[PDB]
Amino acid sequence: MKFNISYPLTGAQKCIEIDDDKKCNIFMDKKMGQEVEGDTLGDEFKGYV
Amino acid sequence: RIPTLIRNGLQTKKRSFFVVVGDHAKEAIVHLYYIMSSMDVRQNKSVLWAYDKILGNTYGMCILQDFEAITPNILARTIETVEGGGLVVLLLKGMTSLKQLYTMTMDVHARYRTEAHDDVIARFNERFLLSLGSCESCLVIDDELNVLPISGGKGVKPLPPPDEDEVDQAKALLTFVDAIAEKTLRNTVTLTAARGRGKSAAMGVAIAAAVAYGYSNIFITSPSPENLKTLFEFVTIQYIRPQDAHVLGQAELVVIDEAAAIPLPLVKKLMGPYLVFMASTISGYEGTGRSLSLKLIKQLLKEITLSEPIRYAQGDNVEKWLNTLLCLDATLPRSKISTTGCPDPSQCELLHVNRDTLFSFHPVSEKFLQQMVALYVASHYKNSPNDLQLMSDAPAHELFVLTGPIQEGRLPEPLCVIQVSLEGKDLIPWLVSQQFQDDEFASLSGARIVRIATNPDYMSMGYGSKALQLLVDYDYVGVSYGLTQQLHKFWKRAQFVPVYLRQTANDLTGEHTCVMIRPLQDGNDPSWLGAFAADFHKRFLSLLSYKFREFPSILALTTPFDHKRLESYANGLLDYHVVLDLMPTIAQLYFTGRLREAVKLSGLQQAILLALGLQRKDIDTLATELNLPGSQVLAIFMKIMRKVTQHFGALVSGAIAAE
Amino acid sequence: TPFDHKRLESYANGLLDYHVVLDLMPTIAQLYFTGRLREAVKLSGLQQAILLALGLQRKDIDTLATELNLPGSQVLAIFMKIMRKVTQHFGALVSGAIAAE
Fold it and tell me: Where does the source fall among the domains of life (chain B) (predicted)?
C-alpha cells in the first residue's frame, strides 16, 4: 500500500511505499478520515497522527 | 539498425541486453519511447516495464528501471520471462557517474543496505562493468554518443550468426523413467535443473502419459504454491498441498514440485507410501543451493538433470550475462576448478576479511569474496542475489573464512565461511522491537549471523564455532534459525541466549524460528537479552500450548511491561500472537479481566478475545458470530483489549495510549 | 487447591484416569506449572515427557513410548509415578497421608 501523505500546515507532499504486510494491517476496516496512529510505523513515524 | 538485429535475434532464439546509460530523461525515457515504436519483433512488443506475479506469462521486450535503484532479483526474474527475439533494456544512470552514482542519488533499491539513506554500491557496479565490458554481447548505448556502433544488425556488423534455433525431455519422460528392474520399479526420481529447463513441462508429460486407467493415475504436491500452472497445463492432475496431502493413499506415481522447499519430515513420510518425480530449481534466483540439495538427496534416489532451455537457445548471451552477474555458478561443492577443489584438505585457518577485498583484483580480490559467496549460497536452502548485493556493497558486512592450505597465489578452497551482518542502529534488528518489549530495541547495534557454512567434507570439526569465536575475537551478536534441539545447542554452545520463539512454523523447514543473542556489551545488550529471556520465561506456558505442535520451549538451555505491550496492541498495530500466545500479556490480561473474557473479551479475535485465545476458535468462525467482515475481527480484538485495560485502570491506560 | 491435592493423589496413588485429572490444565497441568521437576522432558502432567510431553506438548502416546522406551500401558504407570514424585517434592508429609487415606 502506497501512501500519499500530505502535511497541511506547511504544504508537504510526500510518498511512502509500505510493502511489509504487518504495518498496514491497522488501516484495514477503518473508515474514511479516521484518526490514524502512525506508530504502526516505528520507523520514521514515531508518534504521529 | 537495431531493428534488423532484432530479426536476427529472434531467428537465433536469443535475447540481448541493451543498456541505456545517460540522463534520466535523455537517454532513458526518450530512447525507451523510440525503442518501443522502433523495435518490433511482432508489431512492437509487449514491453513490460519493471520499476513475483508475472512468471507464467512471457513478453517480447521489457524495461528495467535501475536509474535510481537496482533490485537484482527482479532483473534476473524479468529476463527469464523474456521471449526469443526480445531485448531487455536496462535503464542506467550516466555511465561515468554510475559507480559513485548512488549516494545522494543512491541506489534506492538499497532495501538490501537499509540505512536511513540509500548509498553508492560501487562494488556491484564494478562487478557489473566487468561482465558487461568483457565481451561484445551486450550493447552499450551511452548518451553523448551521437552514434552508437551496433555490432550486428543489418549489413555486415558484429554478431556471428547462430543457427536458426528451434530430445532431452523425451529421452527423460518415460524413458530414463521406466522404473522397472531387478531393483524396485517404484522409487524416487529427482530431476533438477536451472530455470526454464522444462522441469515442470517434463513433470506434466508423465501426468497423462500415465493414463487414468492405462498407465496409471498420478498426483501432485508443492510448497507455497509455485507455478502449478505449467505442469498441469502440460498435464488427471489434481492438487492437494503436502499437509492436506497427508490424508489418504490413492496414487501410483507422486510428483512434488520443488520438494527441496518442503520440510524434510513431511516430505519423507510422503515419499514412503508411493513412486515419485522430484523436481527442483537450481543455479538461479530463488533456486535451491546445490550443497543443500545433496544433503537432501542423501536422505533418500534416481536423479536426472536437464540442460537446455525450452524458451531460448543455449548460449543466449542475455542468460549468460545474468548468470555471471548474479554468480549462479555452483562448482565448489563437488570440486574447485584448479589443482585443488572438491574436499578442502589441510589445517583449517580462521581469518577475517573486509568488503574492500571486492575491488582489488590480485591476491585477495573479487575471487576470495566470490568463493565465500559460492560456499554460503550453495549451502542454503534458497539462493538469492539480495544476499550477493548485500555482501558486495552493504555497509556493516563482515566476513570470516575458514580456509584450507594457503601459500602461493593459488591454494585450496575454503572449508567454511561466516557472514555477519550488522543490524541495528531485517530479521534480528526489525522484530526485536516489534516482537519484544523494548520500543528502543531497534536502536542498538548488533551483528546477525546471517549465514554460516562449513563444507560438508569438513563438518563437525569445530570450525563452525571457530568461525564465531573469530567473529567475537579481535551490543551483541544475534542469530535467527529454525528451532531444532540440535541446532540450538550449537548456538548455545556458541554462548547465545534464547530471545524468542515465534508462532509460525517455517514454511520451508517446518520448525518454529527462534532468535538468540550473544551479549557483547553489558550496557544494554545483555540487558535486552536477559529481559527478553525472562519475558520468554513468563510466556513459556503460553507458547507451548499455542504451538499446536505444542513443543516445549527448551531454548538453548536444558506486569508493568505487560501493560505497555497490552497498550501497544490496543492503541497500535502490534499483532495478536506477539501479545497473545496461550498466555503472554494477552491471556494474562484475560485471566484478570472481569469483562467479556469468555464470549467477548479476553485476548484474541473470536469471542473476540477469548474465543480465539482461550477457545482456539477459528477466525472465520467468530467473524460469523460477531458478524464481522474479516480484518475487522482484529480491530474488534484491539477494541476489546482497550476496554479491558480501561476497566482495570482508566488513568493508566490513558497515559499509555498517549505515550 | 486442596481439592486438587486429593485428585492428584488419586491419580498418583490410584486408578483415576489422565484426562479426568489432566485436560489442558485441571489439577494435572496445575501441578506441572507448580512442579520444579521434569515438567518439560519428563514430569508435568501426562503420558509423554511423561507428564509434560503429553499434557503440554500434546505428543502422541506412541511417540513417548518410544522415547521413554516403554512397552505401552506402562506409559500411564510412568505418568502416575511422575505425579507421585512431583507431589512428594512439593510436600512429603502431605502426600504420605493422602496416599494412606
Answer: Eukaryota
Helices (H) and strands (E) in chain A, counts: 1, 2
C54 touches chain B (CB under 8 A): no
The set of cell numbers assigned to B149 is 556502433
Q: Which residues of B348-363 are buried (b: 16+ CB within 10 A; e: fewer)?
A: bbbeeeebebbeeeee
Contact B608, B621 (CB under 8 A): no
Q: Do A28 and B629 touch (CB under 8 A)?
A: no
Query: What's the sign of the alpha-carbon dihedral B80, B81, B85, B86?
Result: negative
Q: Is B205 annotated as ligand-binding?
A: yes
The distance of C52 to chain B (nearest Cα, Å) reads 8
Cβ–Cβ under 8 Å, residues B234 and B207: yes
CA dist list (Å): B573 to A3, A43, B82: 17, 13, 41
Q: Which chains touch B (3 or more CB pairs under 8 A)?
A: A, C
Q: What does the alpha-carbon distance between residue B548 and residue B137 come to, in Å, rounded to a whole number?
A: 55
For B17, which DSSP code?
E
Q: What is the 3-state secondary structure (H, E, C) of B186-202?
A: CCEEEEEECCCCCHHHH
**Residue linked to cell 550488522:** B422
Q: Would you tell me how many other CB atoms lie within 10 Å of the CB of residue B96?
A: 11
Q: Do B552 and C40 touch (CB under 8 A)?
A: yes
Find out whether B212 and B237 touch, Cβ atoms under 8 Å.
Answer: no
Q: Is B551 in CB contact (< 8 Å) with chain C?
A: yes
Amino acid occupying residue B190: T
CA atoms lying within 13 Å on the CB side of residue B272: 9
Chains C and A touch (3+ CB pairs under 8 A): no
Hey, which chains touch A, using 3+ CB pairs under 8 Å?
B
The angle that helices B385-393 and B366-379 make with each other, rounded to 10 degrees, is 150
Question: Measured between alpha carbons, how far is residue B408 from residues A10, B412, B435 in Å?
Answer: 65, 10, 49
Q: Is A39 on the interface with B (CB under 8 A)?
A: yes
Interface test mutation site (partner B, options C23, C31, C37, C56, max chain B beta carbons within 10 A): C56
